[PDB]
Design an enzyme around this catalytic site. Structure first.
Site, PDB file in Angstrom:
ATOM      1  N   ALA A 183      14.095  56.982 -53.864  1.00  0.00           N
ATOM      2  CA  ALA A 183      12.824  56.610 -54.474  1.00  0.00           C
ATOM      3  C   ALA A 183      12.916  56.688 -55.971  1.00  0.00           C
ATOM      4  CB  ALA A 183      11.686  57.525 -53.959  1.00  0.00           C
ATOM      5  N   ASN A 208      19.855  66.354 -58.503  1.00  0.00           N
ATOM      6  CA  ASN A 208      20.432  65.275 -59.285  1.00  0.00           C
ATOM      7  C   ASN A 208      21.383  65.795 -60.356  1.00  0.00           C
ATOM      8  OD1 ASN A 208      19.298  62.889 -58.120  1.00  0.00           O
ATOM      9  ND2 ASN A 208      17.346  63.271 -59.137  1.00  0.00           N
ATOM     10  N   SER A 229      17.766  57.404 -55.199  1.00  0.00           N
ATOM     11  CA  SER A 229      18.886  58.209 -54.700  1.00  0.00           C
ATOM     12  C   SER A 229      19.842  57.505 -53.722  1.00  0.00           C
ATOM     13  CB  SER A 229      18.383  59.509 -54.063  1.00  0.00           C
ATOM     14  OG  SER A 229      17.870  60.389 -55.075  1.00  0.00           O
TER      15      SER A 229
END
EC number: 3.5.2.6
Length: 354
Positions: free
Chosen positions: A311, A149, A61
């Site tokens: 991550a 997302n 991210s």
């Protein structure tokens, strides 16, 4: 590096690597504008390849900061406006719940509860449209923040539509190239595979899936970079007005503007910010938070802690900087270890140098 930087870094990172069993790590400290690099351990355990300043890590991210800046650059070019309805750039999105959802809402996770993930099953362009058409918001737009997302990913895809370029081509030409991030990639070229670290998840070597239009993963979490390029990225974000390309300069400023407030946190485009000095303890699968609109948005505040965690299956990254102090840090690791450990280590290092 100055022994002082050396000593705070080594005293902070060595125990972190021990405690978290991190196979390989690279750190950059930006101090009075200049970068200082540190490396430990293994990019590839089995092949005994060390982490170097050339090693590529998956950003996860942290990629969203690139997406935010690319979007900011498109706004500055006059190609898009954050105030525009989503439907302007995707007219096929005819379902009534989209009325009033703007590009700002997509970029800042405030569209009304878009889901964390685009479903795995979405493959084609028609599948993607169906997903967004069928999604039912829980909340009115601009009332609650829910990290997603599917939200920032769609922002990225739509922001580049007027340019006519693919998202990857727009990112390369408009952000990576002008900033000389010449070892930063979405798709890793075969020539660069020698430098691509393996991630480690439960002891197993793993890489992210190749990006695909149906996952919107290039847009949300698909960047790979080196510690050198990431230090340059921090430098560029610390001093945007030193960038020669006019729209890129304003794109960086726009991404560090404060659009919404949740507690002590302010949401930018990709970047997240707190007022500096920060209480270090002030810095869950789903966390829905009411937001206060900042009307109008506060332009990039130099007295800020600006940061982003990231991550993937096998990687854990962190970036933080304080523009007022010309100070920043990048931490790249090939294990996904807990966020509070990253923040703790970053704060210990920056506070000591401030």
């Amino acid at each position: 590096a100055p022994q002082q930087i050396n000593d705070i870094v080594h005293r902070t990172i060595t125990p972190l690597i021990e405690q978290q069993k991190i196979p390989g790590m690279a750190v950059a400290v930006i101090y009075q504008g200049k970068p200082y690099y540190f490396t430990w351990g293994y990019a590839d355990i089995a092949k005994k390849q060390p982490v170097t300043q050339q090693t590529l890590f998956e950003l996860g991210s942290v990629s969203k900061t690139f997406t935010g800046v690319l979007g900011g650059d498109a706004i500055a070019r006059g190609e898009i406006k954050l105030s525009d309805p989503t439907t302007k750039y995707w007219p096929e999105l005819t379902a009534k719940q989209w009325n009033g959802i703007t590009l700002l809402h997509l970029a800042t996770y405030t569209a009304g509860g878009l889901p964390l993930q685009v479903p795995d099953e979405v493959k084609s362009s028609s599948d993607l449209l169906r997903f967004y058409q069928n999604w039912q918001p829980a909340w009115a737009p601009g009332t609650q923040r829910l990290y997603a997302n599917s939200s920032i990913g769609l922002f990225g895809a739509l922001a580049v539509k007027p340019s006519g370029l693919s998202f990857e081509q727009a990112m390369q030409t408009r952000v990576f190239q002008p900033l000389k991030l010449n070892h930063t990639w979405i798709n890793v070229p075969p020539a660069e595979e020698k430098n691509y670290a393996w991630g480690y998840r439960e002891g197993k070597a793993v890489h992210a899936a190749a990006v695909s239009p149906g996952a919107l993963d290039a847009e949300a979490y698909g960047v790979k970079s080196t510690i050198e390029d990431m230090a340059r990225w921090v430098q560029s974000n610390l001093k945007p007005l030193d960038i020669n390309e006019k729209t890129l300069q304003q794109g960086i400023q726009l991404a560090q503007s404060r659009y919404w407030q949740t507690g002590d946190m302010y949401q930018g485009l990709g970047w997240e910010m707190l007022d500096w000095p920060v209480n270090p303890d002030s810095i869950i699968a789903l966390a829905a938070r009411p937001v206060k609109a900042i009307t109008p948005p506060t332009p990039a505040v130099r007295a800020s802690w600006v940061h982003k965690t990231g991550a993937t299956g096998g990687f854990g990254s962190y970036v933080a900087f304080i523009p007022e102090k010309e100070l920043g840090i990048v931490m790249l690791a090939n294990k996904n270890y807990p966020n509070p450990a990253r923040v703790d280590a970053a704060w210990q290092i920056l506070n000591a140098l401030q």
